[PDB]
Design a protein around this ligand. Structure first.
Ligand code: NAG
Ligand code: NAG
Ligand code: NAG
Ligand code: NAG
Ligand code: NAG
Ligand code: NAG
Ligand code: NAG
Ligand code: NAG
Lengths: 287, 126
């Protein structure tokens, strides 16, 4: 099966009587889901993946742009991306796969899992958890220009409220637990140097903050207290929200080979958000 | 290709070129479009950007007063007028797009753009 770029189709369980943007978009763009599809596990097969060169990501990005540029209530719904006639999607089943190189347990499917297309910076919300241990993924770890996508194995709840001023609460215990596991994984990759975190250092104003959309309202939260009982982040709005933090986008500082490496929250290339969900998939021509 | 640049050429210092980029990919009111360039041997650097909806612009200091970035939304087009060209302007010029759905300002980004063209080659002699 050659790898092939083709135009995917989408499937969802949107409702046609519902006014919210994602349902309206999916009702015209997508077909109904197969509620119970079969998955063929491929015995003895190995295939090479490259999550950083995956035309599925480009396609999802265009679709999500279309959704936002189409449009009330705004709650992301699951969208499946699906291989058209003559094609299939290969799914990597290796539970600690770095997204590049060989994968052993592979299965073929017509569609991805249902992905919520959540638009956010710094923290990945409401996504897929790693099945086993925390996983970190980068295109090249020794290039500090390449962002690191972290996938957590346990969700961290983030609850946000408004009183223009607003805040988000995170459990301090759970967050310190999450940072410890991330540190262990970063050391494996950086010659067991000491790991430091620091707040975002620049870029567009919405990437220096944790920014996200909470049913209609755009929230911009200061994450210094996360990267430096509950942790309360101050936010500006430009209504309650509870989400699961399921991942992080990090960037490593450049410089001299000190005894330490420092990492900062980043993001802004929404294509990394889509990679964090699509890393295990690849389109092939079956014919 | 999503983005395709044209207008590159060989020019004499003090001359002018006009670069064009047609954006075949999906655009939106929260996009920025820009131009970046890479001179032989050196790293890629920002040149100019424009907000797709608002038209706010930004330039690298070494082109101010000489380069102008403009757009035509109905043609999905962005343009870089380059006047008073200097040998230091010699480079591959890339058009780029960035979707910024969460932006709260019209000022365009100068880094980390979603996708890039193949580039158009510019040589400025003398
Ligand atoms: C990913 O892991 C595979 C399996 O050991 C290895 O061949 C490959 O070099 C790794 N690549 C990265 C970028 O980690
Ligand atoms: C492959 O992965 C599937 C699902 O993750 C699992 O049930 C199966 O035991 C794994 N190995 C084989 C040989 O099927
Ligand atoms: C998550 O992974 C870490 C190691 O990265 C492990 O210590 C921890 O027990 C795991 N938690 C769950 C709920 O699987
Ligand atoms: C990143 O990866 C490339 C290719 O594997 C390697 O040549 C380079 O040294 C790495 N780090 C850089 C470019 O800073
Ligand atoms: C978020 O709200 C839930 C109730 O839905 C609560 O169990 C949890 O403790 C809250 N988390 C924080 C960090 O306040
Ligand atoms: C880092 O520690 C691992 C053991 O987990 C070891 O195999 C490796 O040699 C160490 N790297 C360096 C640069 O010392
Ligand atoms: C976040 O808040 C701290 C004060 O607690 C401040 O020093 C820092 O500049 C803020 N960061 C941003 C990006 O506003
Ligand atoms: C995450 O999911 C919950 C419901 O599962 C929803 O209320 C919340 O708005 C979602 N967060 C984002 C940022 O979409």
């Amino acid at each position: 099966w050659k790898e092939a770029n083709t135009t995917l189709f989408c499937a969802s369980d949107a409702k046609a009587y519902d006014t919210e943007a994602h349902n309206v978009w999916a009702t015209h763009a997508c077909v109904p889901t197969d509620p119970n599809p079969q998955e063929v596990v491929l015995e003895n097969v190995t295939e090479n993946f490259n999550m950083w060169k995956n035309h599925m990501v480009e396609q999802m990005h265009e679709d999500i742009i279309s959704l936002w540029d189409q449009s009330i209530s705004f709650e992301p719904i699951p969208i499946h991306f699906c291989a058209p006639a003559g094609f299939a999607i290969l799914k990597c089943n290796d539970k600690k796969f770095n997204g590049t190189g060989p994968c052993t347990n592979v299965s073929t499917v017509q569609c991805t899992h249902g992905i919520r297309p959540v638009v956010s910076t710094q923290l990945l919300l409401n996504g897929s958890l790693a099945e086993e241990e925390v996983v970190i993924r980068s295109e090249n770890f020794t290039n500090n220009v390449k962002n690191i996508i972290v996938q957590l194995n346990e969700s961290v709840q983030i609850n946000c409220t408004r009183h223009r001023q607003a805040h988000c609460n995170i459990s301090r215990e759970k967050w310190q637990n999450t940072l410890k596991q991330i540190v262990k994984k970063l050391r494996e990759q950086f010659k067991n140097k000491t790991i430091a975190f620091a707040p975002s250092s620049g870029g567009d104003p919405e990437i220096v903050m944790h920014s996200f959309n909470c049913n209609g309202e755009f929230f911009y939260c200061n994450t210094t207290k996360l990267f430096t009982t509950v942790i309360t982040l101050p936010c500006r709005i430009r209504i309650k929200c509870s989400s699961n933090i399921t991942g992080l986008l990090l960037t490593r500082d450049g410089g001299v080979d000190t005894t330490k490496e420092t990492f900062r929250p980043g993001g802004g290339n929404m294509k990394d958000n889509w990679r964090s969900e699509l890393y295990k998939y690849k389109v092939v021509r079956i014919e | 290709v999503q983005l395709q640049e044209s207008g590159g050429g060989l020019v004499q210092a003090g001359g002018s070129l006009r670069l064009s980029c047609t954006v075949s990919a999906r655009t939106s009111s929260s996009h920025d479009m820009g131009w970046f360039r890479q001179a032989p041997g050196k790293e890629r650097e920002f040149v100019a950007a424009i907000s797709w909806s608002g038209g706010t612009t930004n330039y690298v200091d070494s082109v101010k007063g000489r380069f102008d970035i403009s757009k035509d939304n109905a043609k999905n087009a962005v343009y870089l007028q380059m006047n008073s060209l200097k040998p230091e302007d010699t480079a591959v010029y890339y058009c780029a797009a960035k979707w910024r759905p969460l932006r709260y300002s019209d000022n365009p980004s100068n880094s980390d753009y979603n996708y890039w063209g193949q580039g158009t080659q510019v040589t400025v002699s003398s």
